[PDB]
Design a protein around this ligand. Structure first.
Ligand SMILES: [Mg+2]
Ligand SMILES: [Mg+2]
Ligand SMILES: [Mg+2]
Lengths: 438, 437, 437
């Protein structure tokens, strides 16, 4: 069985500790370290723990929970020197064996199972943008490690060595990396890995953030997936490439169709656009996410879909065949990948199941359009603030049902907690603008 | 004539310079210094100047304007040298036509419309302000002391400067009523007697001028910013208002319940009707809405009541020629000329059309639940500056009273501040997300 | 095939990453790092990427491009780790059509046109560059030493790093000819053997990459900026050029005077004809014209001569298969692909139409008077970057050879730099005028 190979690897690689990973609703990694002597117990009945101290999980009066590891996610952490360490991505179950409704990974699993009913397997291949910042007195800052730009090369790109270190580590963990390059903003970078099913890709996203932040710390740096850490430079975003597969073939490809795109592609897009306002509360979960998604500026805030036009929200790149896909450009890397993929799959399937026609394509540069011109074309915009998107998310009956009322309420609780604090704040901008004059 | 006494004062006090004061749409004082030899020219044909560089005035292609001083506003600045004086001015065009973008002219227009019905509006504002330290010649938001409400020295470290301000004000003709330390650190309040809206607005601009000037002489910075420090009280310009007709207080009616005339209730009904749009004038800054925060001890909930200090409109105890309402939503950063005009037009709309106000609310509105407020139908003010500007655009009455020119200037400056504020990355976001994400 | 040997090298040298190199219109190197597992995909269908964020490439609405590597350009970077390799790429569109904005494709096109007549252009540039100190991790313009021409240690403090660069270059297949300290402080020059224009341009981009990378490893900053220090020499990319037809040097003719063929003179006549417009390509920066200053020891005067090192075009002594002309006006900051293409098209226009060059000038052109230069009809290059861009707009031949797309990109970036440069208030102006005016 799978558990036999796990213990075979432990004896050979001399693994002495296993980390039992999972995420809260926010997507922040959590783990318990156990000696390898408890591994038999962890893979059997599971390791109990107190969930009342995890964000958006359970209450104090019913706090006992259980970690149910996923055997396939077993990897050895390469940065271990005598004394190795391994990790297991876990699901959360209740003491009675019932799956915990609030576990984000279980949510994606549920939505993937529903998609399997209809014969669809959603593949996702995200484009992770991130920043590398300096540390000052052991504390992270928002100072770029280099002042380079798009596709730049050393000596303008000062992070070639650490990016080479990150990619190598990932490959050692079974990743198939496709490309790595310096992004537009100062000290911004992008690592792209090969598409996979939603669950494996989500596990990979959480893993990549762990590896990136870890090695950056070893270099005296700080990696951050925050959407808009610096004002005046490009924000980091998570362009999510998506495609549906059915009967082993790309369900989005249809050679006998215009532009060689099937009606399934169009209906999937129609559903995603139909719910995009509510989805943004998931894919752009921070107050800071809307300082990148700002109306009226060079950002994918205008609800449109087009061909290879990189100013719309949903792009349809040139490749066809088994590479036919759609690129959703609104999400940013701070989102919970399990919940983001779940919300996109739910909306897209709602479009396929119900034959939701998408709007006309907009092959023009939407960024250079006038508000009057946008009104004539009926182009709407995404929520402007976090509170705006949460209100939109509350009303989407399909999304709340697809994510579960437990998860949905936790997302609303943490968001409105951040907002109620942010709206009361007095920022430096207000002093710099009014203090001398008034 | 008035001009003759002005020159009598000049020779006695040996005034050598005269400042020609006015304000842009934002309420910021503007002035030109002319030698006393040019005073005869100013009080006659006026002094020409360039209006293209004043906020919300005229374009570059038709920029020549004329300052027309109001002789009643002549005062000698008590900080001499080489004495100096000042004149508040109305802005006119070269052809003698009044410039309908001038805020002071706007108030004059709405008051003339009130005079058509025989009404004269009186106002008396409670001016809250902060006294902050200067660091390297630049102003800061550090309180000059760490005292509180009605505190006495040594806790109150600004007694000597408040004594100087009140003295200067009284020398300038003010009838000061009281001064005291306010709730927040280094916060204070000076109250002066009421007067007609035009007089009171001139007093408001003068008080800020006197307070800010003397604060500078003491190495401090007086600011009328609404919410300069997070976590402490904010500055609020409570505005007491009353209408007078045929010499008597139109808000008083001894034969009525609570001795409140129907003109009072109708006036309140109209103010509450337009209060969502008035807030763009009375609370014009982005920072204004860090004091007018929903769900906190702040006059955010649209209600009117008696002496209950938690409602938006308060009707204090005094009756007779002292009957008044107190509007507590404004803050000191508003343009007093525009704020009084917007309140006057809205209140007269209530009287003109007999707009019944909602039921009073004498309970503690701050301690009500969101569920309780919905049962009583209590609404809220705009939450942000954009929200209020959007409500101000749709108010056809207010835009017509203030004038399309002034209204457009207000919208332009507000959306300018907003488009800059909404794109900023603030420290709060880095403190909240940088370490974990 | 070539692809088979690439994978043979990968296994032996244990290469794990491959960089896909190219350049924007400005000549700045750009690359994408792909794991060696993706190399099979790159050499087949190619690697797609976004071209909207590359300078002077494509718009946002049609941004999907494809990198198509040239297998001949595969080299292993001698600074290993975890070995790394690189491939120079041509940019194509998703439909397989070549992107006519790609500078490397432009040179290819003009070379194909030269092949139509049986000509192959050869180039060998003399690369002058500076070695500067780093302060707080940022580059500076402080010379690493204070030495001069052909100076030896300890005066020359960059012997160890030049030894490293040449070693790396030779390991990358370069045939290095000589290296030495140049005139200015911390200035140096490395010369490598000539080759065809495409090969040599790849060598130029590689040399700057190797020089700048190793300089960083030693804590320095190598810069190919034309005039980074006022009062010392500037960096110049003398460009030796020759044409080959039927395997022999087309510029050599033993039966002719000075053993110079008519093809040589006609080629020179065409280059001089368009040299005012070529300068926008060969000297593309504002800073380029602080080295090309009229009235100083700099190749500014449009002339051609023999081995006289003061003319714009020099015909060195070697004949036979070494007959060449040396164009001394360019500087290292130019895009070598675009510079070689502009020179080729202009020279072929001279050969095609038999354009007679002006009389040679074998005297010291720098020591001539403005009066003397007018008698001989000697012209001058553009004085500023705007002057050269205006001359480049009117050159219908050059714009057609480089292509309307690349030409427009060049004009856009140049006028962008100029509109920013012309509005600046420089320190020189404050030093000259602030105290007295
Ligand atoms: Mg990107
Ligand atoms: Mg008070
Ligand atoms: Mg030389």
């Amino acid at each position: 069985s799978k558990e036999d190979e796990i213990f075979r690897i432990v004896e050979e690689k001399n693994v002495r500790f296993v980390r039992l990973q999972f995420v809260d609703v926010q997507g922040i990694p959590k783990n318990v370290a156990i000696p390898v002597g408890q591994l038999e117990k962890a893979l059997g009945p599971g390791i109990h723990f107190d969930g009342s101290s995890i964000e958006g999980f359970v209450r104090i009066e019913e706090s006992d929970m259980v970690l149910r590891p996923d055997p396939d996610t077993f990897r050895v952490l390469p940065w271990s020197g005598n004394t190795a360490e391994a990790r297991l991505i876990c699901d959360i179950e209740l003491p009675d064996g019932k799956p915990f409704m609030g576990c984000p990974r279980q949510v994606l699993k549920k939505n993937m199972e529903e998609a399997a009913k209809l014969g669809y397997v959603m593949n996702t291949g995200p484009e992770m943008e991130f920043f590398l910042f300096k540390r000052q007195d052991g504390m992270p800052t928002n100072i770029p490690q280099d002042r380079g730009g798009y596709f730049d090369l050393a000596p303008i790109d000062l992070a070639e060595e650490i990016k080479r270190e990150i990619v190598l580590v990932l490959e050692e963990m079974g990743f198939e990396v496709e490309a790595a390059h310096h992004e537009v903003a100062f000290g911004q970078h992008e690592i792209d890995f090969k598409y996979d099913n939603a669950l494996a890709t989500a596990d990979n996203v959480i893993t990549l953030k762990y590896v990136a932040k870890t090695l950056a710390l070893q270099h005296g740096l700080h990696a951050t997936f925050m959407p808009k850490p610096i004002f005046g430079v490009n924000g980091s975003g998570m362009h999510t490439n998506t495609s549906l597969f059915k009967d082993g073939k790309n369900a989005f490809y249809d050679p006998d169709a215009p532009d060689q795109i099937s009606d399934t592609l169009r209906y999937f897009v129609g559903g995603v656009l139909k719910h995009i306002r509510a989805i943004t509360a998931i894919t752009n979960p921070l107050v800071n996410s809307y300082k990148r998604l700002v109306p009226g500026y060079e950002a994918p805030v205008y609800i449109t879909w087009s061909g290879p036009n990189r100013s719309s929200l949903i792009r349809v790149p040139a490749p066809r065949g088994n590479s036919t896909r759609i690129e959703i450009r609104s999400p940013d890397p701070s989102c919970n990948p399990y919940l983001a993929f779940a919300a996109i799959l739910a909306a897209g399937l709602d479009g396929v199941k119900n034959k939701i026609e998408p709007p006309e394509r907009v092959e023009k540069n939407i960024y250079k359009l006038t508000e009057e011109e946008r009104e004539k074309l009926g182009i709407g915009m995404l929520p402007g603030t976090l509170k705006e998107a949460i209100e939109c998310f509350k009303e989407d009956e399909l999304l709340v049902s697809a994510l579960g009322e437990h998860v949905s309420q936790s997302i609303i609780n943490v968001a409105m907690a951040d907002w109620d604090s942010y709206r009361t704040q007095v920022h430096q901008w207000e002093l710099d603008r009014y203090l001398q004059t008034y």
